[PDB]
């Protein structure tokens, strides 16, 4: 459904997203989506907003991530929706 070439595209996170990304990776002016997805994913795991015990759902209503995505929770398996939420927070280069 989602082509792998999409992970090579270049983007610039908006201020709030950049704040989240910097807690897990070095600050950069331009990121590849592969980088954005990893840092976002790593932020979710280190903060345990995703417990492998709780059937694929990430709970973020008590986190900045919830403010970024505009939702209290979401499934890690519904990738199309994740991309749409992430793009609301970045600008394509
Ligand atoms: C928070 C969970 C992270 C950890 S992880 O792999 O990124 C890693 C362990 C490498 C940090 N994560 C996953 O667990 C995965 C394996 C969940 C799944 O599809 O079964 C993949 C997921 C992912 C990867 C690429 C693109 C999308 Cl939209 C989602 C990806 C993910 C990345 C960002 C967001 Cl916002 C949501 C889910």
UniProtKB/Swiss-Prot annotation:
Region Necessary for interaction with USP2, residue ranges: 1-93
Ranges for region Sufficient to promote the mitochondrial pathway of apoptosis: 1-84
Top-rank lineage group of the source organism: Eukaryota
Compartment(s) where it occurs, according to its Swiss-Prot or TrEMBL record: Nucleus, Nucleoplasm; Cytoplasm; Nucleus, Nucleolus; Nucleus
PTM text: Phosphorylated at multiple sites near the RING domain by ATM upon DNA damage; this promotes its ubiquitination and degradation, preventing p53/TP53 degradation. Autoubiquitination leads to proteasomal degradation; resulting in p53/TP53 activation it may be regulated by SFN. Also ubiquitinated by TRIM13. ATM-phosphorylated MDM2 is ubiquitinated by the SCF(FBXO31) complex in response to genotoxic stress, promoting its degradation and p53/TP53-mediated DNA damage response. Deubiquitinated by USP2 leads to its accumulation and increases deubiquitination and degradation of p53/TP53. Deubiquitinated by USP7 leading to its stabilization.
Induction trigger: By DNA damage.
Tissue specificity: Ubiquitous. Isoform Mdm2-A, isoform Mdm2-B, isoform Mdm2-C, isoform Mdm2-D, isoform Mdm2-E, isoform Mdm2-F and isoform Mdm2-G are observed in a range of cancers but absent in normal tissues.
Written domain comment of the UniProt record: Region I is sufficient for binding p53 and inhibiting its G1 arrest and apoptosis functions. It also binds p73 and E2F1. Region II contains most of a central acidic region required for interaction with ribosomal protein L5 and a putative C4-type zinc finger. The RING finger domain which coordinates two molecules of zinc interacts specifically with RNA whether or not zinc is present and mediates the heterooligomerization with MDM4. It is also essential for its ubiquitin ligase E3 activity toward p53 and itself.
Note: MDM2 RING finger mutations that failed to ubiquitinate p53 in vitro did not target p53 for degradation when expressed in cells.
Family stated for the protein in its record: Belongs to the MDM2/MDM4 family.
Purpose: E3 ubiquitin-protein ligase that mediates ubiquitination of p53/TP53, leading to its degradation by the proteasome. Inhibits p53/TP53- and p73/TP73-mediated cell cycle arrest and apoptosis by binding its transcriptional activation domain. Also acts as a ubiquitin ligase E3 toward itself and ARRB1. Permits the nuclear export of p53/TP53. Promotes proteasome-dependent ubiquitin-independent degradation of retinoblastoma RB1 protein. Inhibits DAXX-mediated apoptosis by inducing its ubiquitination and degradation. Component of the TRIM28/KAP1-MDM2-p53/TP53 complex involved in stabilizing p53/TP53.
Disease listed for this protein: Seems to be amplified in certain tumors (including soft tissue sarcomas, osteosarcomas and gliomas). A higher frequency of splice variants lacking p53 binding domain sequences was found in late-stage and high-grade ovarian and bladder carcinomas. Four of the splice variants show loss of p53 binding. Lessel-Kubisch syndrome: An autosomal recessive progeroid syndrome characterized by short stature, pinched facial features, prematurely gray hair, scleroderma-like skin changes, small kidneys and consecutive kidney failure, followed by severe arterial hypertension.
Protein's name according to its UniProt entry: E3 ubiquitin-protein ligase Mdm2
